[PDB]
């Protein structure tokens, strides 16, 4: 019942002595930028302390004044107020205690579940592991989508861009990629930049309804929050993701709008009066995203043994990134999209014309690419994805002949229906991630010709019923494929016998 | 203490105060003699504040004494505001004398915290076929009417007000931001003659008013809606044009000493929009249901202002100039309009399949249009000829006569229920009306009236 | 035969959906019961701490000064504790 | 432009009687405006044209293709619109001109779609024929007004 | 055909019963946690106000002894610091 | 002497020096107690200089002491740089210890004078058939490399690196302008595994480095190449992407506040390209030949960056995804790839006629393939079917097993001479090999090897 008197006992054990501090005075306040006079020893990036527990960061160390940006609300600050050096750079809490929690860009809890118990803090701005400390990407990151996992595979330590116009499934694809990690071993981070607070709450409510929240850290910097917090949020989330990578483990990070981070950095720059370039962005907007995205990496066993000081051995850690960018009317030639397309390892392009034509996942497989490729796939998916590529390519070449299918040559007419049946197989539902064995049944059935007698309109109910059949009569075979995604003549014969038996009675 | 005007340039005014008496950001100031209010926007330094006039400056001079009020603009709130017309400063702009206020709130406020947000999917029926089908609204949700000049934003909003506000049991706030003074007069006489003025608070800031007035009118109307939400009530908030708030910031931004960004916009476009939009929400105490009309400069949806607005709304209704140019109203684009409620778990599988079925036919017709123009219609397959006929029927069955548009058309208005809409579109997709001509579906209501129209 | 097989599978799919949606209403029913009772339990306990905290607030004020200045404050703490408790 | 154009208005009997100190009673007063704007090669996306179209109670779009095609009044009925509508017309013109503009707007579309198609139904032929007659009727000479 | 239809239906109903149970445990856990964190939130919120009032008393208490005894001790101590 | 930091704005730093000790333009400065290098860009006057940090500016403060070095950024040169990875400043980024350097050279110098140019055009024999026939490279020339990923770009660079060192006693330098850290690690291991690492010096400017590093890496790699040329060698300079060199210049120009030019590029675009490209030439001692990968913005060849670069290119090698599917691993497109050296007044009438003969037959076959597909193989004349047979033999004879590709091809590598290349294609054009099967002309090297592969 009584707690106030004991927490006060600790307060009587805190320093009451004088301390030498380096100070300054506020000269002007406008649009979130407070200009200060004094602070002769302040460092570029240091946090300034203002009256009222408000903090800022020094960004323009000019000869006669300091231009500082508020990491909170600046409408209470005024001319003549005192400003103090802290001697510290910006740091955020890190560790497993953040899993299943919603925090602001500074690591403060916003979910109302109580204080965080983090045992360590780390710097938001850090350099990425150098060239010689890395290891090639050769481990998979399954997203649960047949179109992405079969044709645009993502590996542990890769950076894959999700690019496309507004309202076409960009957020859905990244949230489902996080949901699929609840049993994988990969910890997940979702960073919300410039979103409305009710939208972030619908994603967290969907991470909880799907059992994925306990494996995810949610970092939020909503649309009403300071441009400095929106600019810093991706670096704070990256720092929380780097804990697991540097200690021998694997993590996944989603930056829901890098284009909104660029817009927030442009606001601060034009208000500090920095020289403008194309689309009014500052001269270092490429360096902004590049400094962030080069941290997503795979590090060697020698880096993990050096960092852990021997504690962790034989394990390679990684941080995989799924940055999201919005294009205006399909214009990929815009300044920010051009920069990020050149920084990333691959791109998943979503299209409005495909999305309106019922192709729900909307992945344009003709232009989407993964430079890591087959190295990021298990043996079974790598063997069944080769023909899927040929059939869709043939369908893109022969799509005008559908209105003249009668007049076509038989060989070409055979290819045309195969292309149309493989195209209908790629369609999937939201919040329905598929496992390696369940994806393998669908890809095997199409690639081995088991769909030639199924009307293009019944391909989906055939897939749904086939998976349900194998989940009842072949549970041991699905469990075997799900161990490592292995393939051999016994698994090939086993799947064939089950599909033949399925068609013969179901 | 007291300040002196030192620099007047257009709508922006600089006032110099003692260096120990500098007024706060967003603080309201009053000019001596002249009846003018100035809001501090920036503290330049040396006791000087930069402010924007909430009136005209034709009578202002250098050296006029200015008084610090110690607070931001305080407007009247609560029951006393119902059935009254007011300006940005909260003064009554109707001849009914003073308002009996029992409290005044400051227009500037923090957005509700992350723990205060509330989630609800109660379906709200509008009575319009296109919206009830592809853009189902939700109680407590945010709706946006996107469109250029002359496509129906005001008309559609008036129809909704009529099909929702009139029946709504709770109160309502109507904010006319950068609106035509003629529309405000027609709406006031309409609410007064309909006996509904008793449950509607009216705040007006039209195009003839100074930039500062058009920049804060939205915060005044929202402050009145927030008082009612915080009392535990269910409220309706209608904003005539929220673009005028962004534009007033563009008109004044350069005089405030800010460098311009892309498409000549203020560098604070996304933050100024987020600070307003995050307050228009339904918390755990009460629910604000809001409809905003969003102007699209030169019909280009990629313009920074419209493009930054989509992320703040639950329901996005898009009006197309190409459909309006064919005499089809409501001019809603069924391929660009979207809602968070268009989900099988929320609306049901039958409605969802009918909406996706209509969108598939319209997207396929959009790509066959060029073929038909160059080669002709006989060079199409039998399946394509049938699909083109149904697409043209669906495109005309989305038109609807409205009660607020009878002066423009001469035809009586109609209200279609959601059951009737789904049935009419499911029938056209199925083929139950492949004999009736496409002209029978133009401006009718439910599918029975198309059957009657075809005979005549 | 296959029309009846399809009817058996389709009715089972419908029945399964009803089994889950009834459980959602049952779970919400008990959740609201627990929430209402717990709020009342805490409210009563909150009155007991309200009076107790008033008296100890004066004692906690003197304990901070009571370390260093407490030698001199032994005398002031008697006058200041009775005056501060009565002033609140 | 908004400060200029909001003065053109209709004022109530109460407004006139107050200003005229009781001299004029029972009379409403008005100022109607006809602003003109020039576009470059039909580009309406320019800053000034965009502003003025968003202030007025309607617009009359004149098209160059129509002017060269012989329709000298050149009023594009699909793009032009009045926000006052039937309230600005006498009873006879209000009833006779019912949906003529939206019907002309649909006739211009039907003509292009039926330009190279095989024989269509009576509904299509009748609509296409009525449209070519209303289109020829809307032509008028300069300095020749009609009562 | 009919025996396999009954088998398909049996799995659908068996998994539906476990799914219904699964949502029941998740829903009750949400409400349980919400009430437990509400209790600790009330304790920490009042704790902040109680501290602020105790500090206000300390300011007055300090002022009397601070002027005579502490003014010489503070000035001399600051020169040593 | 030493100066003091007076202003820090991002990567741009201003330093004040005594009036008698102001550092020169492009001079390198060292901050005391921190591993940060500043390159001087402009002399503002009054003792103050504007410089760009060659590293991060986090943790720096005003008033820190700065030391002048007396010269521009000076990097290690010579034999010791082979098989090593270095940054823009010449520091060993690999954990292999200090570089065993005997000399250091500054990265900024004038291009060789009018009198230093070589007396004619000398082809560089790559030993690769398709390149030596259709894309002849001149010594001291610049080659543009076009194509996507996964088409053999890395394998083609490793083969050229092997052949210049083993068949011509030369060396290579690779400049990673805006290098991806993952790809930079993968390329280093692929070259170690392929045994070519001891024949090349690696200079990397990674994407996460400031704009000044990405702009100067091309000059660091070029300075190492200049040293070998002076030794009496023919050298290969590989530039990972020339578009990123242009962009780094645009970024630096914006940071320094210069007024932007057409399409937003720096006003110095043509001069910055000329300063780099004019050092790559054939002198009277040795010759630096360069292979540069080229990126085209928005697929527009008229854009200032592609336009400026193409003005300095002597050859264009295009790698084709289609050709790769056929199975020709080199994957160079014989119809799209071109060279300015393909002139009878330079390579003689015989080489020119043989190359143009191959291109004519391959053009006709691409047209006939559409005929065979649309109408059938029976529709062609006897002369056209004979051409199709020679075209197929030519197409396969353009293939070649590379020594770095033995792991993929399962066969030993081949180095074909220009004489053997011309003789083989001339014979197939004349019909001397019409009796042999086309497969006998696949992955064989010289024409005598096709004869034997057919004998078995
Ligand atoms: N299989 C699917 N995959 C993705 N989205 C789907 C699918 N089926 C339906 N949808 C719906 O499509 C819409 C996609 O919204 P989402 O937020 O993911 O798109 P977005 O491009 O990220 O939008 P925004 O730009 O606002 O962030 C949602 O209504 C979603 O429920
Ligand atoms: N539903 C409708 N029915 C008939 N005419 C309409 C309709 N909506 C718009 N219009 C036409 O356009 C005008 C309405 O435009 P308005 O609603 O003011 O557009 P906005 O607010 O987008 O500028 C009317 O005067 C009429 O001529
Ligand atoms: N000369 C070659 N011989 C055989 N296979 C090759 C050859 N060149 C390319 N390939 C094949 O193409 C793949 C990619 O080639 P690579 O040089 O790495 O292209 P990129 O660098 O763009 O990725 C190789 O791993 C190999 O499978
Ligand atoms: Mg999104
Ligand atoms: Mg309007």
Tab-separated table of C-alpha atoms in Angstrom, chain A residues 120-375:
chain	number	residue	atom	x	y	z
A	120	UNK	CA	22.320	-0.371	-21.614
A	121	UNK	CA	22.194	2.702	-23.923
A	122	UNK	CA	23.819	3.306	-27.337
A	123	UNK	CA	24.518	6.158	-29.813
A	124	UNK	CA	21.879	6.870	-32.536
A	125	UNK	CA	24.585	7.976	-35.063
A	126	UNK	CA	27.284	5.313	-35.609
A	127	UNK	CA	29.461	4.077	-38.517
A	128	UNK	CA	28.624	0.787	-40.300
A	129	UNK	CA	30.924	-2.280	-40.014
A	130	UNK	CA	33.803	-1.910	-42.546
A	131	UNK	CA	34.255	-4.066	-45.727
A	132	UNK	CA	36.645	-6.633	-44.181
A	133	UNK	CA	34.305	-7.479	-41.222
A	134	UNK	CA	31.355	-8.563	-43.444
A	135	UNK	CA	30.224	-11.974	-44.765
A	136	UNK	CA	28.317	-12.724	-47.997
A	137	UNK	CA	24.500	-12.980	-47.724
A	138	UNK	CA	23.482	-16.695	-48.065
A	139	UNK	CA	20.675	-17.239	-45.436
A	140	UNK	CA	16.942	-16.684	-46.288
A	141	UNK	CA	14.360	-14.246	-44.806
A	142	UNK	CA	10.923	-15.610	-45.739
A	143	UNK	CA	8.167	-12.963	-46.226
A	144	UNK	CA	5.379	-15.585	-46.638
A	145	UNK	CA	4.439	-14.320	-50.153
A	146	UNK	CA	4.864	-16.700	-53.127
A	147	UNK	CA	5.618	-13.832	-55.554
A	148	UNK	CA	8.347	-12.311	-53.324
A	149	UNK	CA	9.934	-15.455	-51.785
A	150	UNK	CA	10.062	-17.295	-55.169
A	151	UNK	CA	11.171	-14.446	-57.547
A	152	UNK	CA	12.586	-11.587	-55.389
A	153	UNK	CA	14.220	-13.472	-52.462
A	154	UNK	CA	15.518	-11.491	-49.449
A	155	UNK	CA	18.562	-12.726	-47.493
A	156	UNK	CA	19.816	-12.045	-43.918
A	157	UNK	CA	21.723	-8.721	-44.045
A	158	UNK	CA	20.168	-7.561	-47.385
A	159	UNK	CA	18.423	-4.194	-48.077
A	160	UNK	CA	15.305	-4.589	-50.222
A	161	UNK	CA	13.273	-1.493	-51.204
A	162	UNK	CA	9.439	-1.596	-51.336
A	163	UNK	CA	8.602	1.058	-54.000
A	164	UNK	CA	5.263	2.180	-55.554
A	165	UNK	CA	2.382	4.732	-55.495
A	166	UNK	CA	-0.038	5.496	-52.572
A	167	UNK	CA	-2.635	2.967	-51.288
A	168	UNK	CA	-1.389	-0.223	-53.154
A	169	UNK	CA	-0.210	-2.567	-50.313
A	170	UNK	CA	3.312	-1.232	-49.404
A	171	UNK	CA	2.556	-1.290	-45.640
A	172	UNK	CA	0.689	-4.625	-45.858
A	173	UNK	CA	3.673	-6.379	-47.517
A	174	UNK	CA	6.131	-5.128	-44.843
A	175	UNK	CA	3.801	-5.872	-41.849
A	176	UNK	CA	3.169	-9.425	-43.168
A	177	UNK	CA	6.963	-9.878	-43.535
A	178	UNK	CA	7.220	-9.000	-39.765
A	179	UNK	CA	4.305	-11.350	-38.827
A	180	UNK	CA	6.030	-14.295	-40.565
A	181	UNK	CA	9.096	-13.928	-38.212
A	182	UNK	CA	7.206	-14.875	-34.955
A	183	UNK	CA	8.638	-18.481	-35.098
A	184	UNK	CA	11.824	-17.844	-37.257
A	185	UNK	CA	14.385	-16.472	-34.747
A	186	UNK	CA	14.648	-13.011	-36.423
A	187	UNK	CA	13.775	-10.099	-34.069
A	188	UNK	CA	11.802	-7.333	-35.838
A	189	UNK	CA	11.718	-3.496	-35.700
A	190	UNK	CA	8.979	-1.288	-37.228
A	191	UNK	CA	9.692	2.477	-37.530
A	192	UNK	CA	6.733	4.781	-38.211
A	193	UNK	CA	7.771	8.212	-39.628
A	194	UNK	CA	5.171	10.987	-40.203
A	195	UNK	CA	2.135	8.612	-39.879
A	196	UNK	CA	-1.059	9.590	-37.985
A	197	UNK	CA	-1.292	8.090	-34.431
A	198	UNK	CA	-4.474	6.053	-35.181
A	199	UNK	CA	-2.789	4.311	-38.210
A	200	UNK	CA	0.223	3.167	-36.086
A	201	UNK	CA	-2.293	1.763	-33.536
A	202	UNK	CA	-4.078	-0.353	-36.216
A	203	UNK	CA	-0.730	-1.964	-37.203
A	204	UNK	CA	0.128	-2.710	-33.508
A	205	UNK	CA	-3.426	-4.084	-33.013
A	206	UNK	CA	-2.814	-6.318	-36.079
A	207	UNK	CA	0.656	-7.346	-34.778
A	208	UNK	CA	-1.084	-8.361	-31.491
A	209	UNK	CA	-4.047	-10.148	-33.239
A	210	UNK	CA	-1.469	-12.223	-35.234
A	211	UNK	CA	0.887	-12.955	-32.227
A	212	UNK	CA	3.849	-10.945	-33.701
A	213	UNK	CA	3.975	-7.998	-31.189
A	214	UNK	CA	6.045	-9.902	-28.518
A	215	UNK	CA	8.884	-10.255	-31.144
A	216	UNK	CA	8.682	-6.584	-32.376
A	217	UNK	CA	9.962	-3.150	-31.241
A	218	UNK	CA	7.702	-0.287	-32.449
A	219	UNK	CA	9.355	3.140	-32.830
A	220	UNK	CA	6.966	6.031	-33.533
A	221	UNK	CA	7.404	9.655	-34.679
A	222	UNK	CA	3.875	10.726	-35.719
A	223	UNK	CA	2.839	13.635	-37.992
A	224	UNK	CA	2.297	16.210	-35.125
A	225	UNK	CA	5.812	15.574	-33.636
A	226	UNK	CA	8.905	17.790	-34.263
A	227	UNK	CA	10.730	17.406	-37.603
A	228	UNK	CA	13.920	16.639	-35.576
A	229	UNK	CA	12.221	13.561	-34.011
A	230	UNK	CA	10.951	12.417	-37.452
A	231	UNK	CA	14.504	12.903	-38.876
A	232	UNK	CA	16.116	10.917	-35.971
A	233	UNK	CA	13.558	8.030	-35.612
A	234	UNK	CA	15.124	5.742	-38.357
A	235	UNK	CA	18.567	6.068	-36.676
A	236	UNK	CA	17.055	5.300	-33.219
A	237	UNK	CA	15.291	2.187	-34.614
A	238	UNK	CA	18.488	1.146	-36.460
A	239	UNK	CA	20.470	1.453	-33.180
A	240	UNK	CA	17.925	-0.840	-31.432
A	241	UNK	CA	18.262	-3.359	-34.342
A	242	UNK	CA	22.123	-3.240	-34.244
A	243	UNK	CA	22.112	-4.604	-30.638
A	244	UNK	CA	21.064	-8.084	-31.862
A	245	UNK	CA	23.388	-8.046	-34.913
A	246	UNK	CA	26.531	-7.083	-32.967
A	247	UNK	CA	25.825	-9.826	-30.369
A	248	UNK	CA	25.527	-12.729	-32.866
A	249	UNK	CA	21.797	-12.688	-33.641
A	250	UNK	CA	19.504	-11.662	-36.532
A	251	UNK	CA	17.076	-8.728	-36.867
A	252	UNK	CA	14.680	-7.205	-39.454
A	253	UNK	CA	13.870	-3.447	-39.697
A	254	UNK	CA	11.068	-1.670	-41.597
A	255	UNK	CA	11.273	2.104	-42.285
A	256	UNK	CA	7.645	2.844	-43.232
A	257	UNK	CA	8.424	6.083	-45.150
A	258	UNK	CA	12.011	7.161	-45.903
A	259	UNK	CA	10.411	9.852	-48.138
A	260	UNK	CA	8.842	11.444	-44.986
A	261	UNK	CA	12.271	11.398	-43.237
A	262	UNK	CA	13.724	13.243	-46.281
A	263	UNK	CA	10.855	15.819	-46.093
A	264	UNK	CA	11.557	16.407	-42.349
A	265	UNK	CA	15.322	16.831	-42.997
A	266	UNK	CA	14.530	19.325	-45.838
A	267	UNK	CA	12.399	21.427	-43.413
A	268	UNK	CA	15.248	21.708	-40.846
A	269	UNK	CA	17.812	22.500	-43.586
A	270	UNK	CA	15.855	25.283	-45.344
A	271	UNK	CA	15.108	26.821	-41.901
A	272	UNK	CA	18.869	26.788	-41.050
A	273	UNK	CA	19.334	28.506	-44.483
A	274	UNK	CA	21.573	25.783	-45.958
A	275	UNK	CA	22.141	26.111	-49.761
A	276	UNK	CA	19.348	24.276	-51.710
A	277	UNK	CA	19.588	21.815	-54.643
A	278	UNK	CA	17.113	19.818	-56.848
A	279	UNK	CA	13.499	19.662	-55.422
A	280	UNK	CA	14.817	22.072	-52.683
A	281	UNK	CA	16.645	19.230	-50.811
A	282	UNK	CA	19.999	19.994	-49.082
A	283	UNK	CA	23.297	18.883	-50.692
A	284	UNK	CA	23.708	15.857	-48.305
A	285	UNK	CA	20.253	14.140	-48.723
A	286	UNK	CA	21.993	11.143	-50.451
A	287	UNK	CA	24.371	10.825	-47.445
A	288	UNK	CA	21.289	10.933	-45.077
A	289	UNK	CA	19.803	7.677	-46.467
A	290	UNK	CA	23.159	6.066	-47.364
A	291	UNK	CA	24.555	6.455	-43.777
A	292	UNK	CA	21.367	4.740	-42.484
A	293	UNK	CA	21.034	1.918	-45.073
A	294	UNK	CA	24.738	0.815	-45.079
A	295	UNK	CA	24.293	-0.268	-41.351
A	296	UNK	CA	21.887	-3.060	-42.442
A	297	UNK	CA	24.479	-5.816	-43.001
A	298	UNK	CA	25.778	-9.322	-42.185
A	299	UNK	CA	28.922	-9.396	-39.963
A	300	UNK	CA	31.455	-12.254	-39.740
A	301	UNK	CA	32.167	-14.561	-36.781
A	302	UNK	CA	35.425	-12.622	-36.093
A	303	UNK	CA	33.505	-9.329	-35.680
A	304	UNK	CA	31.028	-10.973	-33.241
A	305	UNK	CA	33.864	-12.608	-31.217
A	306	UNK	CA	35.718	-9.238	-31.152
A	307	UNK	CA	32.606	-7.254	-30.058
A	308	UNK	CA	31.384	-9.845	-27.505
A	309	UNK	CA	35.008	-10.120	-26.251
A	310	UNK	CA	34.816	-13.909	-26.761
A	311	UNK	CA	31.434	-14.440	-25.064
A	312	UNK	CA	29.602	-15.321	-28.343
A	313	UNK	CA	31.570	-17.546	-30.745
A	314	UNK	CA	30.851	-19.268	-34.086
A	315	UNK	CA	27.810	-17.082	-34.787
A	316	UNK	CA	27.381	-14.409	-37.519
A	317	UNK	CA	24.922	-11.586	-36.753
A	318	UNK	CA	22.753	-9.585	-39.179
A	319	UNK	CA	20.342	-6.678	-39.714
A	320	UNK	CA	18.001	-6.910	-42.754
A	321	UNK	CA	16.214	-3.737	-43.944
A	322	UNK	CA	12.904	-3.229	-45.803
A	323	UNK	CA	12.748	0.558	-46.481
A	324	UNK	CA	9.454	1.832	-48.022
A	325	UNK	CA	9.158	4.713	-50.555
A	326	UNK	CA	6.110	6.309	-52.199
A	327	UNK	CA	6.293	7.409	-55.876
A	328	UNK	CA	4.083	10.116	-57.405
A	329	UNK	CA	2.129	8.718	-60.414
A	330	UNK	CA	4.815	6.007	-61.055
A	331	UNK	CA	7.700	8.558	-61.362
A	332	UNK	CA	10.757	6.558	-60.186
A	333	UNK	CA	13.054	9.328	-61.628
A	334	UNK	CA	12.332	11.754	-58.717
A	335	UNK	CA	15.388	12.777	-56.609
A	336	UNK	CA	14.793	10.780	-53.354
A	337	UNK	CA	13.546	7.550	-55.122
A	338	UNK	CA	16.612	7.674	-57.474
A	339	UNK	CA	19.019	7.918	-54.493
A	340	UNK	CA	17.487	4.968	-52.542
A	341	UNK	CA	17.077	2.742	-55.650
A	342	UNK	CA	20.880	3.159	-56.150
A	343	UNK	CA	21.760	2.439	-52.451
A	344	UNK	CA	19.687	-0.800	-51.988
A	345	UNK	CA	20.484	-4.448	-53.001
A	346	UNK	CA	17.134	-4.860	-54.816
A	347	UNK	CA	13.649	-3.435	-55.381
A	348	UNK	CA	10.072	-4.772	-55.150
A	349	UNK	CA	7.892	-2.544	-57.387
A	350	UNK	CA	4.127	-2.474	-56.656
A	351	UNK	CA	1.793	-1.214	-59.454
A	352	UNK	CA	-1.599	0.545	-59.384
A	353	UNK	CA	-2.726	-1.007	-62.710
A	354	UNK	CA	-2.012	-4.557	-61.370
A	355	UNK	CA	-3.680	-3.778	-58.004
A	356	UNK	CA	-6.888	-2.509	-59.742
A	357	UNK	CA	-6.904	-5.663	-61.994
A	358	UNK	CA	-7.366	-7.922	-58.891
A	359	UNK	CA	-3.632	-8.883	-58.604
A	360	UNK	CA	-3.693	-8.079	-54.839
A	361	UNK	CA	0.045	-8.455	-53.963
A	362	UNK	CA	0.634	-6.088	-56.996
A	363	UNK	CA	4.334	-7.107	-57.436
A	364	UNK	CA	5.525	-6.281	-60.976
A	365	UNK	CA	7.879	-9.290	-61.393
A	366	UNK	CA	9.097	-7.980	-64.810
A	367	UNK	CA	11.073	-5.029	-63.272
A	368	UNK	CA	11.510	-6.121	-59.602
A	369	UNK	CA	14.975	-7.600	-58.842
A	370	UNK	CA	17.144	-9.000	-55.998
A	371	UNK	CA	20.940	-8.758	-56.698
A	372	UNK	CA	21.563	-11.480	-54.040
A	373	UNK	CA	19.188	-13.859	-55.953
A	374	UNK	CA	19.349	-17.662	-55.461
A	375	UNK	CA	21.877	-17.339	-52.573
